[PDB]
Amino acid sequence: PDGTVLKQLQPPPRGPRELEFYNMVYAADCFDGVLLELRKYLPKYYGIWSPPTAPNDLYLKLEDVTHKFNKPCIMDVKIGQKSYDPFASSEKIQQQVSKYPLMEEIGFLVLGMRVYHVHSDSYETENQHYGRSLTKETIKDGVSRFFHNGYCLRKDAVAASIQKIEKILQWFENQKQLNFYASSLLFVYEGSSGGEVEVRMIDFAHVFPSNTIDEGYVYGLKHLISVLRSILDN
Template sequence: MSEKPKEKNSLALEIQKTAAQGSCQSQAQDGKSQSRLNGCVPLSHQVAGHKYGIDKMGILQHPDGTVLKQLQPPPRGLRELQFYTQVFGEDCSDPQLLALRPHLPRFYGTWVSPDTPNDLYLKLEDITRRFSRPCIMDIKVGRRSYDPLASPSKREQQIRKYPLMEEIGFLLLGMRVYHPSRDCYICHDQFFGRSLVKDTLARGLARFFHDGEKLRKQTVCLCIRKVRNILQWFESQKQLHFYASSLLFVYDGASGVHMATEHNNNNNKHHQHQQPQDLSRTDSPAKSSCDEEGWAEGLPESLQNGVQTGSPLNLEQSNGNGETVMEEEGKERDLSECFVDEGDEGDMEVRMIDFAHIFPSQTPDEGYMHGLRNLLSVLEKILQD
């Protein structure tokens, strides 16, 4: 575990201090062979972000079942390390940070390989570990995917990647969905996400909840409840703004409810199972990897065709400040199909990840909340159609 600050400064002040530092305890991964990683292997279920073996830095899986995320160059890596250290510190007494813990992967300190002592890793909970066939979706949330310190060129680069980010407030970075009837995974990458516009968002996200034969409505309900809980946390705090942070969605794609709790007592046992076929492809706006025959069976006609009877987002209204906002009418909709018992909460996980761009603030994080509200609108659209 990293050393705790000697003084109990607020997280905002600590982040401000570490952001100003000019050195870091880590270096970029320089292509070391997997045999020198003390049994660690690339994370097999990653759907977005830096991937080990492709990028200089990536996510690894430790033999004990945790995941290892290498620190980014300063100040990003220090900022993320300080965030986790403060939130999960034994001396943390801030009620807002304590309330945030359930929405994050648990932090187990830092890890260094004896073979690469200059590479520092965050040791984190593997959210996918207890699921036998984890279906995973990564969504970047917020109206801006660049932080206040970004250079003009960086801002232009990020805006060019997805010009609708300002309006919609979120971007699909990737997904991996298990189809039991075919024993295969269907994958979509960031290019598919960037191809989605207001009229096709619901159709695109609905693919994550479709098992090749039917739409998993109960899973959508769980998703809505968990995202609402995260929104409630943001509505209650004013000390932090999150940029380029994501939500990670995970549920078990196996037939029935296969939580496989015995896997918790056997290191990485489910990764020893014979893995289903992975139908990953590089998506483009012109072609999607889910064009396989029958993938949309069970979806409402409006979602199958990609033409929706009323856009999930009404972005034509003004909030009086020259900005467009989603339609507030029906914000607390009566989702009559959405019955979720307390015992069902564990059937799905929604966690916040990626905290290299967190900044202190004295105002609500309107950009992140805008994205959460629009995401909820799309999820409700999927369920109601």
Template sequence: MLQISTRRQIMDSSLALGRLEIKSSVRQESVNCGPENEKNLQDGSQAQLNGCVPLSHQVAGHKYGVDKVGILQHPDGTVLKQLQPPPRGLREMQFYSKVFLEDCSDPCLLDLQRFLPTYYGTWSSPETPNDLYLKLEDVTRRFVKPCIMDVKIGQRSYDPFASQEKREQQIKKYPLMEEIGFLVLGMRIYQVTSDSYNTYDQHYGRSLVKDTLQDGIAKFFHNGSTLRKDAISASIQRVREILCWFEGQSQFHFYASSLLFVYEGSPSGKTNASKTGRVNRGVTENNNNIRAVSPAENSQGLSNTSRLQKGDFAHHARECPQDNGIQKCGPQISLQLPNGNSLSVRSETEESPGEPGLLVHSGVEVRMIDFAHVFPSKTPDEGYIYGLKSLLSGLQQILDQ
């Protein structure tokens, strides 16, 4: 179990970055970025590295034991994301290290920290020292019945350096990405009536078109009994804060990056207050009574609510006031939709007593994840901004129905 300071962990991360860069410049094959015990995994058993197990509530991305790289859960409750092959893994580690540098003084990066899972450096098992993992906060840790959705944001899911073959491959996966600006990669929704989870994978997200997208997203906020408008309202506010950050920054462009939505599905509406998401001893027990929804079921139930019409995804949001160059967003949201109507909503939020001005969203988290394709820039990230505004428009219409 790791018990080292953040400074030491960042230092370890930097050293690891240097070591991997040296190896990759000589021979990339010398960096083992996949599980070494593949035979054990193929036999169907779960390889355990120092008590680590495959992340049980993962809804999208590379899965341990299925893909060459994957995600584990550490006994202390943190998440271990296996480093991807160079240059993607190195790029993501460098990004986390830059944002969470202990003596960071950049207001833009300091503000960004609250939208990311906390970074605790790198981790590796003594048995497989060449398999490096990013050690991250488990955003779902404080939830009793976490409902989770992974949404890829942006008009392009390939970076500027992608080959023509890669570009065509990504466009073919979801041709509507440029127009819609986001893609649902996976969902896990707690159903109060059956005390189980419904899960939807990336194929479900790719099946959503303009006419079915609103209902497809609304499904995430329906617990089998009612539409959780409180979770929608809080999610809108959280996404709005992330949008404000993007409208005020010109340091990075993000490609193939996602937003991770989490809300409390427990009928009591209470989260595990003692499980704050920081490194703690013990492991959160997650309800794994999951029902995978078949492709046939995926297409059903999408006609019960109003559809999004063509063009509904583009809208303009108010500009955020600035204070000393740092954008700050209050709890009041105002959106200008294509039909000319102005919509406002006040989220179920409260100010943190210890940090005035910092909004606390009870029972809801929205965090940015997946940074293997983040690049320096000197201009605003218009593609990501477009995706956020498009998603906000859809969420607002679900809330208003």
């Protein structure tokens, strides 16, 4: 209710790595311009949290970016060509690539969506198997489904999403210090205007220091932008 969410740390090493990522980015004494700009695109972070009687039980206290919406329409999109990190074993690489073998080709994967429908006063939800079933031939209509609300295709929300993704893309083109694997973009628009539209980066259990542009992430964002752009011509 307070506008936040508690996300339980994933098992080690993933949860500890995500905690350290948030701790690094939101360090009070940080004056790295790259990290200060990155804050704009993340949920606000309120630190590690645990229940008063259970210090063993670890959570991240994060901004709930859907809180300002009346009927939020939400889509989660995993970004990049590789869902596995630079230290994955042969087995883990195979595990990750088999979850969605089109990741290299498309550069993104819809993890899920929840869409408000005006005429029925109800939500339609798609699970992980929806996005994993999409191919090059069906990715445009697949993404389009998210924006079908209010007796129309919400081209206002599509255009606003492109404009917000572009700012994230620009951040990625001006930093050579972090590479992001199996991270996502969370899209929110108002289902009940341009409008209230929010796009935030989430899921940081596989973010690593780097010396290069995150090329896979850039490829994914560019392709996602291209798909959304084609939807404006519907």
